[PDB]
């Protein structure tokens, strides 16, 4: 087709058409948007791709950004589905465009995907991130980029030009700029761009809301299971300098210029080998190189910006899965494994609290134990398992998200909030984990419509129902299917949200309201005094 041929500012591309149950879609995979950040460019902000002669093969996905590969459970789908599915390279700055067939005539609203993976991992080519069903079912344009992770993306020596930090967020921003100047070529409207992301991806989205040079690049935000003000999401200049300096000692590196010049000579693998060493304490849901608060990309801490900010003109969609915490516990909490039901003792519970809430006084830990113990059933193993799941999930996800949603809604933004309560029938993680971190994604992209996968019929319907909610938000800033159950905005007072499962929309109140008061109001007062 002449529809698989498109010209962008830098040259010509050759796409591929993709089959789906509802009809074909045109795909353009692995378009370069930056000069490859190797050699003397490692650690630097990205430079725009220079114009090319000829036709770029955009039929297949490009290299995954150099990263650690999670090998907790060899051969297990639950962990491997998140692993790199293409060879690793430092030359990894490529993006992907999905557009309807035939190409729309009126400019259609654009959806941009930013993946998560704790800023240490992730890739735009993972199966669970397939643009094809969403573009076919709702006729929007879908874009997704690769951005640098781990040390390559987030190692900072704050104040230096050789390693300023945050360069993976700058990768995201360069791709957004590319969208402004090229998305018309595919039928997309640059005046209607909605950012969406999960986990670190959602944290990323939130940081674009708080960094003015990004505000001209999009109009709406969806944050799934993540928030910039999460305790894992940012790090200070002090810590970031300590962590990068530790790493340089491990790989043998003697002046900030000399230090990075030395670092740039080390093979990528030698750097990944040492990434996990630099983590300060014992913890789950903590990662070595994350965005730094340096005064540049963020002019202050995410919390101070959220509190001060003006958000009139904004529509934001926020949400969380039913069991945010459970996935992470098997990474070190005593008694937890995916290979049994992890019916822990109370002694394990108390030890696990110290792990899922790093860096706090002994007093603060007793406060957590206080709030999360059922004193009618202080020793019941199943309940102690669910409770530590909640501790980790609340601290890291539900309560940062809830606080963000309340501050935005009170300061201009129009906010809609959900809890995703459906456990996928194909889920490979055990049942005690429930609906874990990142398991709403496969439905948002409508992966159940894929024939070669074993989803039920009600789930196919559910997925299409969800794709409609997300597409309605991108077009209008309102997920509501006009007209006739309705999804109300979230406000700080009434705190209304909706459950997303096979049953119809149900409206509830308070996103874990009692817990969030402990984490957001009381705990800070305690630590500020002890």
């Amino acid at each position: 087709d002449a529809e698989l041929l498109v010209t962008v500012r830098g040259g010509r591309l050759r796409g591929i058409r993709l089959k789906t149950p509802g009809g074909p879609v045109s795909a353009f995979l692995g378009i370069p948007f930056a000069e490859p950040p190797m050699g003397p460019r490692r650690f630097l902000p990205p430079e725009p791709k220079q114009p090319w002669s000829g036709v770029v093969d955009a039929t297949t996905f490009q290299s995954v950004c150099y990263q650690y590969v999670d090998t907790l459970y060899p051969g297990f789908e639950g962990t491997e589905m998140w692993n790199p599915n293409r060879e690793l390279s430092e030359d990894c700055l490529y993006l992907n465009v999905w557009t309807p067939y035939p190409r729309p005539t009126s400019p259609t609203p654009v959806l941009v995907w930013i993946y998560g993976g704790g800023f240490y991992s992730g890739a735009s080519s993972l199966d669970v991130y397939d643009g094809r069903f969403l573009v076919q079912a709702e006729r929007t344009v879908l874009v997704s980029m690769n951005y640098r992770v781990g040390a390559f993306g987030f190692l900072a020596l704050p104040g230096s030009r050789e390693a300023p930090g945050n360069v993976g967020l700058l990768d995201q921003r360069l791709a957004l700029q590319w969208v402004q100047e090229n998305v018309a070529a595919f039928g997309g409207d640059p005046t209607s761009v909605t950012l969406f992301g999960e986990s670190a991806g959602a944290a990323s989205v939130g940081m674009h809301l708080l960094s003015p040079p990004s505000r001209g690049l999009f109009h709406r935000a969806v944050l799934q299971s993540g928030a910039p003000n999460g305790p894992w999401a940012t790090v200070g200049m002090g810590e970031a300098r300590r962590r990068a300096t530790q790493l340089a000692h491990l790989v043998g590196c003697p002046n900030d210029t000399e230090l990075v010049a030395c670092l740039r000579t080390r093979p990528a693998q030698v750097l990944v080998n040492h990434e996990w060493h630099v983590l300060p304490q014992e913890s789950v849901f903590r990662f070595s190189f994350v965005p730094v608060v340096d005064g540049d990309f963020l002019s202050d801490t995410p919390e101070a910006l959220i509190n001060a900010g003006d958000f009139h003109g904004l529509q934001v969609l926020v949400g969380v899965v039913k069991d945010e915490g459970s996935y992470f516990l098997v990474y070190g909490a005593p008694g937890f494994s995916k290979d049994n039901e992890s019916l822990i003792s109370r002694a394990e519970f108390l030890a696990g609290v110290r792990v899922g809430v790093p860096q706090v006084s002994d007093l603060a830990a007793e406060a957590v134990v206080l709030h999360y113990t059922d004193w009618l059933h202080p020793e019941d193993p199943a309940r102690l398992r669910e409770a530590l799941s909640d501790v980790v999930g609340d601290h890291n996800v539900v309560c940062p998200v809830a606080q963000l949603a309340g501050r935005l809604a009170a300061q201009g933004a129009r906010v809609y909030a959900y809890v995703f309560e459906h456990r996928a029938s194909t889920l490979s993680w055990p049942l005690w984990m429930g609906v874990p971190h990142g398991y709403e994604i496969e439905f948002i992209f409508g992966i159940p419509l894929d024939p070669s996968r074993n989803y039920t019929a009600e789930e196919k319907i559910f997925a299409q129902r969800l794709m409609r909610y997300w597409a309605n938000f991108a077009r209008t800033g309102d997920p509501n299917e006009p007209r006739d159950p309705q999804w109300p905005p979230y406000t700080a007072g009434a705190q209304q949200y909706v459950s997303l499962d096979l049953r119809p929309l149900e409206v509830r109140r308070g996103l874990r309201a009692q817990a969030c008061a402990f984490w957001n109001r009381f705990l800070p007062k305690l630590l500020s005094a002890t």
Partner: protein
């Protein structure tokens, strides 16, 4: 013996360690990320925990 094999940046494959032992390198303290699996029995450290074994197959999991 048939044991798993991989680095920090490669997927886990099966290999024939034979009469040697196996190992599972991991971060000692949480998060206990696996950093390696292979043949032999190498020293660990403060941050690196090594677990050795001899049998049966796939024992370094």
């Amino acid at each position: 013996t048939m044991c798993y094999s991989h680095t920090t940046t490669s997927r886990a494959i099966l290999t024939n360690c034979g009469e040697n032992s196996c190992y599972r390198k991991s971060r000692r303290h949480p998060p206990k990320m696996v950093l390696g699996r292979g043949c032999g029995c190498p020293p660990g450290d403060d941050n690196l925990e090594v677990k050795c074994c001899t049998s049966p197959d796939k024992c370094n999991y």
